[PDB]
């Protein structure tokens, strides 16, 4: 019996079977509900739209994200997300397939309680397990030691592991990722004359952020270059046919990852978070940590981020260390791909939470069994 890997991220649900490069269902985690007066009768009008169907008809819908910063708020919407990704995207019964689920660290435990109760009572499985995303990222990296910076759409977390031993006191969580960058890009696109206020326009701002933005190596030199000459300005076409051109906003938007005070937040950037997570570890393993930095998630897909992060850590680390950052082209789905590693492992078959253990222990064995 093949297992299931379902990364339920804040932005994109990535679901599929065991042992694939791409997740079989990659779609944004949105539930659409109509906000206008339906005047035509019949023609297959639906009260809700999930996935790319909501993306297609987004002009006449209000889109809701059931997951915000790794914590699921609306649960009936999350049940609709799971029912759509089981019965329609993958078209398989949940009663005959074990399902590995991912989780951000330092998540509230009631979220684990409710996903265990819903997964064992609404979409009742033979077994399910709740795992950490950074461990799967280190699996997909193909190594054992190293520090992982995961950055999805709600959660950016740093986890250091040495020889298979994670350090739970050194795990750091930062609620700053691509949704906050999309909101900041909405805030700074208003400067050039372009207004985007609705939830349907969030997809357009996210598409602009995905296509045109990049990470600058030196911030102030790129400010001087953008202010002096318009060589950095690039164009984009909206679906209504309008043409926009952006300059410095190509590299002001991801800079909030390296400078969180742009959106008004006290905590430090991702390179200071990486460095402080390194120095919280014991002193002997740090040389192994500096040469094995791992980035995963879609937020580190800008084509300037590895050289900038190397420059910042080499500024922070002492000069006798080789700062090597692993930045594969496959790192957008590597959180899923290491889930293909762990679910296919022969040593993982005894660690699943079965139906019977849930039946004596209630929905509380998931704390003592998982991380």
């Amino acid at each position: 019996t093949t297992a299931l890997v379902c990364d339920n991220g804040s932005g994109l649900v990535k679901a599929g079977f065991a042992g694939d490069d791409a997740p079989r269902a990659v779609f944004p985690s949105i539930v659409g509900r109509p906000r206008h007066q339906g005047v035509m009768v019949g023609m297959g009008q639906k009260d809700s739209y999930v996935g790319d169907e909501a993306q297609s008809k987004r002009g006449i819908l209000t889109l809701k994200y059931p997951i915000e910063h790794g914590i699921i708020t609306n649960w009936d919407d999350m049940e609709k997300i799971w029912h759509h990704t089981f019965y329609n995207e993958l078209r398989v019964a949940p009663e005959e397939h074990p399902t590995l689920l991912t989780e951000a660290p330092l998540n509230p435990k009631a979220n684990r309680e409710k996903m265990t109760q819903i997964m064992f009572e609404t979409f009742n499985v033979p077994a399910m397990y709740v795992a950490i995303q950074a461990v799967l990222s280190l699996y997909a990296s193909g190594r054992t030691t190293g520090i992982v910076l995961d950055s999805g759409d709600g959660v950016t977390h740093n986890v250091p592991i040495y020889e298979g031993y994670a350090l739970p006191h050194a795990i750091m969580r930062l609620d700053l990722a691509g949704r906050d960058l999309t909101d900041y890009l909405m805030k700074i696109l208003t400067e050039r004359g372009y207004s985007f206020v609705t939830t349907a326009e969030r997809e357009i701002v996210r598409d602009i952020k995905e296509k045109l933005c990049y990470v600058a190596l030196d911030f102030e030199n790129e400010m001087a270059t953008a202010a002096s000459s318009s060589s950095l300005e690039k164009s984009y076409e909206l679906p209504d046919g309008q043409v926009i051109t952006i300059g410095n906003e190509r590299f002001r938007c991801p800079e909030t990852l390296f400078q969180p005070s742009f959106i008004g937040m006290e905590s430090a950037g991702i390179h200071e978070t990486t460095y402080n997570s390194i120095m919280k570890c014991d002193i002997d393993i740090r040389k192994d940590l500096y040469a094995n930095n791992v980035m995963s998630g879609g937020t580190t897909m800008y084509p300037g981020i590895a050289d900038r992060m190397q420059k910042e850590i080499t500024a922070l680390a002492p000069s006798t260390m080789k700062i090597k950052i692993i930045a594969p082209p496959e790192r957008k789905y590597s959180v899923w791909i290491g889930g293909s590693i762990l679910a296919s492992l022969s040593t993982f078959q005894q660690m699943w939470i079965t139906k019977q253990e849930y039946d004596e222990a209630g929905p509380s064995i998931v704390h003592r069994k998982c991380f």
Partner: peptide, 23 residues
């Protein structure tokens, strides 16, 4: 030890890597 001395003198990885190419 004496009966032991008497009785003597007498893959996950390639399986997943094949199927990642299917997408």
């Amino acid at each position: 030890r004496k009966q032991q001395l008497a009785e003597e003198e007498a893959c996950v990885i390639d399986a997943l890597l094949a199927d990642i190419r299917k997408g």
